[PDB]
UniProtKB/Swiss-Prot annotation, chains A, B, C:
Domain of life: Viruses
Similarity comment: Belongs to the asfivirus E301R family.
Remarks, miscellaneous: Shares some weak sequence similarity with PCNA (Proliferating cell nuclear antigen).
Protein name, per record: Uncharacterized protein E301R
Organism: African swine fever virus (strain Badajoz 1971 Vero-adapted) (Ba71V)
Keywords: Host-virus interaction, Inhibition of host innate immune response by virus, Inhibition of host IRF3 by virus, Inhibition of host RLR pathway by virus, Late protein, Viral immunoevasion
GO biological process, one term: symbiont-mediated suppression of host cytoplasmic pattern recognition receptor signaling pathway via inhibition of IRF3 activity
Upregulating conditions: Expressed in the late phase of the viral replicative cycle.
Function: Plays a role in the inhibition of host innate immune system by acting as a negatively regulator of type I interferon production. Mechanistically, interacts with and prevents host IRF3 nuclear localization to inhibit its transcriptional activity.
SUPFAM superfamilies: DNA clamp (SSF55979)
Subunit composition and interactions: Interacts with host IRF3.
S-S bonds: none
Amino acid sequence: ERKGILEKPVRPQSRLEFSYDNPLIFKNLFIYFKNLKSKNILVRCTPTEITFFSRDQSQASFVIATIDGKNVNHYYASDVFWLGINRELVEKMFNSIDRSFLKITIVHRYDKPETLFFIFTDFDIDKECTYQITVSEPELDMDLIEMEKSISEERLKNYPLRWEFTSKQLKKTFSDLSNYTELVTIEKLGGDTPLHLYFQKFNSISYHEMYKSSNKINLTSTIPKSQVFQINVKIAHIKSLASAMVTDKIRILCEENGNLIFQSEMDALMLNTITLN
Amino acid sequence: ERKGILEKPVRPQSRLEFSYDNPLIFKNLFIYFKNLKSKNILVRCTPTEITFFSRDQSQASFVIATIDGKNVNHYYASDVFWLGINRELVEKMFNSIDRSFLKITIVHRYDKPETLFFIFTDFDIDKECTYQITVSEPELDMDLIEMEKSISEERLKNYPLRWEFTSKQLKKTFSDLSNYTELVTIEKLGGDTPLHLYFQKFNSISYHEMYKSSNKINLTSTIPKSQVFQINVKIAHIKSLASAMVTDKIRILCEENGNLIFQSEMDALMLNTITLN
Amino acid sequence: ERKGILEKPVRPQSRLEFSYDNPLIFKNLFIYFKNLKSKNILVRCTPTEITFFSRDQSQASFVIATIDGKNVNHYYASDVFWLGINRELVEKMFNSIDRSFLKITIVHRYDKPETLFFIFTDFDIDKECTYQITVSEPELDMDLIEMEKSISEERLKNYPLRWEFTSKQLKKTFSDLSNYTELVTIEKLGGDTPLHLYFQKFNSISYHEMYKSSNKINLTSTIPKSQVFQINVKIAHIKSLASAMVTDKIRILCEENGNLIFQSEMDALMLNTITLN
């Protein structure tokens, strides 16, 4: 069961000690990172939580994934420190997580600064699988790191349009769009009106997705009644986020200069994706 | 529920108005067209039904797919007119049909002669997806069109050999054959005898499929008792028809100069495939 | 039902007559042969059983698959004779075995020395599928054939380390390993100790699989208490054996000069894989 944040580490050379009984979340998160073509993952460990940061290849999307120490089975970190992980190196490791593993344990030791330990346990046969992954002390992408500030509950006022999609709905919408376009217009008139997602390709195909019941997608709008909100957004990274099916239910927030924020939470994991322009 | 053919269109500029609560049939039919490497689909709309015509790439197979107006939820057409659809343009649209869509609506308007409208509805969340597809007024392949006459119930006398396969059986037989050959011999002696499907590849492999019980595959024969019926037929297009699993139960008819007709019906859709030589 | 070995063949020109009601075993065995990149299969028929021999492409692994006549539905062979089968020729035939076939029959006739007959029966519709496969009188790989002697119950004394994996466990272990390495160290200290599977790749990743409960994997050891057993083995062929999921439960035996033997039995089939170095 879940004991949360510990005052002292079970092992003594431990700078980080983490244990969690849903290792499948790491698999799906790293499938997301693969889909974004992230080459290197930035990791911040603090005494209260571990955060994974990355950009997509186009550098336009920012991903921040937080795992809350108080909501995992065991958590200890001595202080604030950073690690760099080559994503390709760990891809197959995280993809190897399946139903046979009921625990993931992560350890980082003072006396082995370039190693990160991942331990998977199969309890049916007392099998323990230990990975020693070479990691580095990373140069910090400060723009990426500070994007976290730009996703506080308080900072989300200038987001006049927001709604929720299930994983299935998000995947469907952006798969359907991606079939024919890289760009989509999001439009909504002020007031009690439908949400429009649409595009036009001259002399071939135009497509229009209209959501007639705001209530059914939990849409909230503060668009002034007489105004039209209309932004044009890129959808590549959204397909990635969708397919990765990491969550359950995804909150989507739009801002008038075209930034799009996707948020989902599921137990200990909080996933944020911010895409600009 | 199903209201069939209407006297007047709900919308007024409508030359065609079509609605149907099993949109999955369009998906499977267009998977068939893709498998046949059809580049362009010919469409005839009349006040009683809509028919889709195509040839396969080899031009040897003729496909005629009819959707009966009286058996759909809503149908209206002003007169007889023709439309041409680029198959590749609409491929992803039709492939996007899934369980979330409970209705497909098709509209063609007088004042927009180069547009065909496809509307899909998700009733769980009041989501409406509207495609505007560029279409053309087609030059008519008259040989293709008149192949329809060559599939009337009356015209099927000179077919002395016929039987039925389930979708599963058809797929199995022509997948098994396609593994090793492009051509198969169909042979049946007059009288109460087994059906043979077979081929020979010198110094590698010969294969023989024998159906010992005519009753179990609903075989009917008018081959004179003392005669042998034997034709050699190409099977590529048949694999396509099979894999597309559009139907349930497929009637197969053979003629002595080697033409092969496949027919299946399921609610509003009637699918005919004629292959020559 | 199972009548076992017959004194006389139903047909009279038969040198071999074989029938069996689990044809799926042939499919999975030939998937194994495909995974090993076996080009030619050696077949020994005797009056008591039929044996399939092959090497993998690297020639380091030896596969011996025996089907016991007394445990099949019908078996007859006149004497000891050998056949050679091109694996690629028969690949699609064996892959075509599915749920619709409840019987496989194999026949070899005196008067047709270069033909091997495979007959599959679908009893739902009285359909009989007969393959005539060109085969040859093979030059004998005597090293391969005599590897059978090196797998007698008696010869397995100098195997001080052995345990059992389910199909799922074997696939998991060698898929996990194959992600990152071609070679693995198997290590076990004498006495009541854990089994180690591990490797090291400098400056990227090391991996260690430890089995803490010998009982749970049915491990038996005769390693002297004060000694360490340690061998380095190649794993490619093991992935093949695993994925082919031919069995249920697989016995693994290790010898101090690095040979690894895998054995599984399921009804009439006994499968042995010996890999050297």
